[PDB]
Each structure stands twice: as structure tokens, then as C-alpha cells.
Amino acid sequence: MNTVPFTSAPIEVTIGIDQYSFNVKENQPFHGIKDIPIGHVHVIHFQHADNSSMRYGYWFDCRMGNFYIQYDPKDGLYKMMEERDGAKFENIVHNFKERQMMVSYPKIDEDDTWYNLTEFVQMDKIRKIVRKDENQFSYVDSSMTTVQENELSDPAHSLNYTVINFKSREAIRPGHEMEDFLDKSYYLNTVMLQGIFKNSSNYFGELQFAFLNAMFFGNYGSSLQWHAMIELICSSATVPKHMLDKLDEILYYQIKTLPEQYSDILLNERVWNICLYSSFQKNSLHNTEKIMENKYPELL
Amino acid sequence: GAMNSSNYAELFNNDIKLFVDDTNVYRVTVHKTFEGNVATKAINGCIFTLNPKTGHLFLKIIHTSVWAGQKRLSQLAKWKTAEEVSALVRSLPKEEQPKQIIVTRKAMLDPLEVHMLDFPNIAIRPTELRLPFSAAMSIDKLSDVVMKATEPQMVLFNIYDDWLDRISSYTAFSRLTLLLRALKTNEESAKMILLSDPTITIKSYHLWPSFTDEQWITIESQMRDLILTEYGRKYNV
Ligand SMILES: CN(C)S(=O)(=O)Nc1ccccc1Br
Numbered sequence: 001m002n003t004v005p006f007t008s009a010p011i012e013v014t015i016g017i018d019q020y021s022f023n024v025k026e027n028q029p030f031h032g033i034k035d036i037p038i039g040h041v042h043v044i045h046f047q048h049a050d051n052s053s054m055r056y057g058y059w060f061d062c063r064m065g066n067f068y069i070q071y072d073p074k075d076g077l078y079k080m081m082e083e084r085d086g087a088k089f090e091n092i093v094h095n096f097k098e099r100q101m102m103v104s105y106p107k108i109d110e111d112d113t114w115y116n117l118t119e120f121v122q123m124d125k126i127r128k129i130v131r132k133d134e135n136q137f138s139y140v141d142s143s144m145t146t147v148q149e150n151e152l153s154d155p156a157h158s159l160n161y162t163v164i165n166f167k168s169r170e171a172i173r174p175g176h177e178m179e180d181f182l183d184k185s186y187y188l189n190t191v192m193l194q195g196i197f198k199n200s201s202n203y204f205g206e207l208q209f210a211f212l213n214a215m216f217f218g219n220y221g222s223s224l225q226w227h228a229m230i231e232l233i234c235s236s237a238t239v240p241k242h243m244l245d246k247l248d249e250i251l252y253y254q255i256k257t258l259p260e261q262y263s264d265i266l267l268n269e270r271v272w273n274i275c276l277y278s279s280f281q282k283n284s285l286h287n288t289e290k291i292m293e294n295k296y297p298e299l300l
Numbered sequence: 301g302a303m304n305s306s307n308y309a310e311l312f313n314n315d316i317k318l319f320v321d322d323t324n325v326y327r328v329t330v331h332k333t334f335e336g337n338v339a340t341k342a343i344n345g346c347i348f349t350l351n352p353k354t355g356h357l358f359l360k361i362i363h364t365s366v367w368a369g370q371k372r373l374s375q376l377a378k379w380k381t382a383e384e385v386s387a388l389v390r391s392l393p394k395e396e397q398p399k400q401i402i403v404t405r406k407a408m409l410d411p412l413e414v415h416m417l418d419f420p421n422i423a424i425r426p427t428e429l430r431l432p433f434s435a436a437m438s439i440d441k442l443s444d445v446v447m448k449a450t451e452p453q454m455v456l457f458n459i460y461d462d463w464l465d466r467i468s469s470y471t472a473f474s475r476l477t478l479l480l481r482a483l484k485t486n487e488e489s490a491k492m493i494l495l496s497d498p499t500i501t502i503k504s505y506h507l508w509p510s511f512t513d514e515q516w517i518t519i520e521s522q523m524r525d526l527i528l529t530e531y532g533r534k535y536n537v
Pocket residue numbers: 005006007008068069070083089092
């Protein structure tokens with residue numbers, strides 16, 4: 001089990017760890033989070049009690065180093081940092097554990113939610129979308145814009161998601177305009193899967209990461225990216241059967257986890273009706289269609 | 301953005317633009333079969349592509365052979381329209397290519413945008429105007445060339461005849477849309493109005509009769525009367 005210890009908690013803050021969260025009061029004796037499952041990526045995120053503006057957080061993988069949080073009173077935020085002195089870090093984690101000033105990652109044993117949301121998400125791919133190569137972890141917040149958004153202003157702080165555009169030369173073969181626009185299989189399978197992502201796992205991983213940035217940080221461009229990657233599959237007549245089955249599972253757990261109250265902003269009516277009712281895949285997303293109809297029948 | 305009553309004078313500035321109307325591209329007659337079912341039979345169609353400033357009309361004739369063995373013809377018709385407009389633009393010298401293309405029906409926006417990806421600097425625009433270009437097939441010489449065609453063909457016309465020698469393009473477009481609106485509302489009346497006087501003929505190289513200025517004023521009044529009446533005859537007023 002891994003641990004993310006905290007130097008202190010000087011300001012009141014709601015702290016999230018993956019899909020869990022807890023309130024920490026100003027100067028409460030809080031010193032971090034223990035029992036974090038090894039083998040998955042994780043996200044630790046923050047919303048100050050004085051500013052529900054700017055949710056922000058850090059994607060990390062405990063196998064890549066020893067990480068800890070300390071509040072920076074100049075920049076005014078909880079910062080992730082790395083301690084390469086392993087002895088010193090193990091020592092600091094042991095005393096905090098002995099004084100019981102840490103919350104436990106509260107995973108129910110029956111619960112596969114986090115695995116199902118992050119199945120294909122890799123830290124190495126996250127670090128290519130969020131470019132800050134001197135750190136092993138990746139900062140994201142509510143306000144960061146995507147490359148594609150910037151094209152339509154600071155590139156160092158951008159989300160470098162794979163650009164998908166249905167009305168672009170990349171998507172449309174000369175001479176197959178109508179064919180390729182109505183059936184996007186060539187753009188999905190040749191351009192994107194074979195050409196750019198290399199395999200469907202990398203595609204799904206980016207799709208899952210965009211959704212999670214949309215859910216945890218309300219990141220608008222991430223929501224756009226998640227819907228675009230969905231729409232490209234739903235608008236393709238020819239999709240490997242294993243990809244359709246896995247997409248249905250992916251989307252099921254994403255819809256299941258979404259807050260019932262955020263459906264109005266994080267769900268694009270047009271794309272979902274296409275996937276579920278008009279598209280080629282109308283009959284192929286059985287789990288996703290059932291949970292959507294029973295939980296958000298308004299949207300449809 | 302969309303073209304409407306407020307940005308109407310833009311049509312007559314010196315930025316080359318074309319209206320594209322696809323209404324008459326896919327045309328059918330509906331008939332009964334021997335078994336008593338219903339079938340369609342396609343007839344020749346046309347794309348109506350018009351420079352409103354100059355009157356140049358690029359009438360691309362759509363031969364029924366282009367539908368053979370195709371499904372979902374109404375959807376295909378929009379893509380075929382787009383393919384042919386794009387081909388037209390590519391055939392033109394750079395300095396004659398339009399800066400804007402205005403489509404008369406919103407369903408042409410995506411087909412045309414996709415076919416024109418090679419011309420990112422050509423704006424594809426809808427309009428809020430209810431233009432009467434579908435009535436182009438009520439102009440006898442245009443209907444005649446469409447129906448006689450035995451293969452795909454482009455025919456070039458000036459839809460304003462020689463009017464621009466005496467009036468502005470704003471006035472010429474207004475006359476054209478009045479004539480066409482009249483032909484759409486009551487074709488027979490409209491045509492009677494235009495041809496009633498046998499001494500006023502249509503030159504071989506023209507589409508409309510050789511009215512004097514005074515005669516165009518009388519004609520235009522008769523067309524307005526026609527349109528208002530049918531409006532009453534229809535809504536009872
Ligand atoms: C001991 N400290 C409370 S500290 O130094 O402020 N915190 C710290 C430093 C390195 C690694 C982990 C932590 Br938490």
C-alpha cells in the first residue's frame with residue numbers, strides 16, 4: 001500500500017483522492033493519505049473552502065516515486081512534490097502512521113469502480129498530454145484549455161489531447177467526402193487507431209483521462225474531448241467487436257459515477273442520442289443505454 | 301453568419317459570391333405500379349448556382365443516370381450538389397473563385413463545407429431569406445435544356461439578360477426574385493403576364509422578354525398584384 005503524506009493543512013480545503021473526498025479544516029492536524037492501492041494511477045485534488053473557483057489536482061502513480069503535498073503560501077495552493085531520499089520519506093510516513101494523522105484510502109473490497117474508470121489510463125500517456133517533464137506527476141485544473149481550443153493562449157499549460165475534427169482533411173479522403181463523413185470508420189481505424197494511437201487501449205486511455213478531468217475539475221475542453229472520442233466510434237459503421245464491448249463497459253462506469261446533478265453540463269445531448277439511437281452503434285451499447293435511460297431519461 | 305434582410309446589400313458588393321440552390325437537383329414523378337404500389341421515376345434535374353452581382357448562372361444539369369443503383373437519393377443529392385459546386389470552383393481561375401458561397405437550404409452546409417475543405421478561405425453561409433430559386437424550372441428555356449439533356453452538362457446563362465445595361469444589380473436581383481416568386485405562387489398567371497403581348501418577344505440569347513423600362517414597371521406591378529391575391533386566395537382575406 002502507498003502513502004501521500006502532507007507537510008500541513010494550513011487552509012480549509014476539500015481534498016479528493018480518486019472518487020473519494022473529505023473536508024479538512026484550517027490548520028487541522030492532517031498529514032496525508034495512506035493505504036493507496038498500488039498499480040493504478042491516482043488523482044489527488046483540491047477545492048479551497050474560500051474559493052470554489054479552481055478545482056485543481058495531480059495525476060500520479062506511486063510506482064514512479066515518493067510524492068507528498070505541502071501548501072505554498074506564495075502561490076497559494078497545495079503542491080505535489082517528490083522526495084528522492086527514500087529513507088527520510090519512509091521515516092516521515094512511519095511517524096505520521098504511528099500518530100494516526102492520516103486518512104485511509106477508503107476502498108470497499110467489492111468495489112472495482114476506480115479500476116473500471118482507469119483501466120487503460122497510463123501515466124506515461126498522461127505526461128504527454130500534460131507536458132511538464134521535470135515532474136513525474138501531472139497538474140491539471142478547471143481552467144486549462146486544450147490544444148484544439150487554443151487553435152480556435154499559453155501552450156505550456158495546455159492539455160495536448162489528440163486533435164479530432166470531423167470536417168478536416170485528416171478525416172476526409174478526397175473522393176470519399178460523403179462516404180467518410182457519414183461513416184467515419186476510415187478515420188477511426190486507419191487514421192486514429194492504426195496511425196496515431198497505435199492501438200485501442202491508448203485510445204480508450206485518453207478517452208478515460210478526458211472524462212476524469214471533466215468530472216473532477218469541470219474542465220470544459222476535456223468534456224469536449226471525451227464526447228469527440230465517443231462520437232467517432234459511434235459514427236463508425238465498422239468497429240472491432242472487442243472495442244464496442246469494452247466501450248460499453250467504459251461508458252457504463254462513467255455514467256454510473258457522474259454526479260446526478262452535473263448531468264446538465266457534462267453530457268452532450270446530441271452525441272448521446274447519436275450513439276444510443278441514431279448511429280451505427282445504436283444496438284451495441286446495451287449496458288450504457290440501460291443506465292442512461294434509467295438515470296438520465298430527461299437528457300434523451 | 302447567415303444572410304438575412306439586414307445584410308442584403310452585401311450581395312451587390314465587389315466580393316465574388318455565389319448562391320447555390322439544390323431544390324431541383326433530385327426530381328421525381330410518383331406513379332402507381334401494376335400491383336397498385338407506388339414508385340418514383342427520376343427526371344433530369346439541375347443545380348442552380350448564381351452570381352447575384354453579375355447575373356452569371358452556372359446551370360449544372362443533373363442527368364437521371366447519376367442516380368442509377370444509388371440508395372437514399374435525397375441525401376446523395378446534397379452531396380452530389382456539393383461535389384459539382386466544388387468542381388466548378390476548381391475549374392475557375394483563382395481570381396474568379398468566390399469568396400463566399402450562400403446555400404439556400406441549411407442541409408447543404410455540411411456537404412459543401414466537406415467538399416470545400418481545400419478552400420478554407422471560402423466562407424460557406426446559410427441564409428434566412430426564403431428565396432424563390434426553386435421556380436427556376438418555370439423559366440421555359442432553362443426547363444427545356446434540362447429536360448432535353450442526354451448526359452451531364454454545364455450550361456451558362458445570364459439570368460438578367462441585358463438588364464444591367466440599364467439598372468443596378470440590386471434592382472436586377474429584386475426583379476428576378478419578384479418574377480420567380482410570382483412563378484412559384486401561380487405559374488400559369490405569372491406566365492400569362494409575361495407573354496400576353498405578342499409583340500414583345502424573347503431574344504434568342506435571352507431568357508425573358510425585351511420589355512422597355514415602362515413595360516417592366518407595368519409587368520412588375522402585375523406580378524405584385526398576383527402575389528398579394530394568391531396570398532388572400534390562400535389565407536382568405
Ligand atoms: C517532515 N515534514 C513535515 S516536512 O518536511 O515538512 N514534510 C515532508 C518533507 C518531505 C517528505 C514528506 C514530507 Br510530508
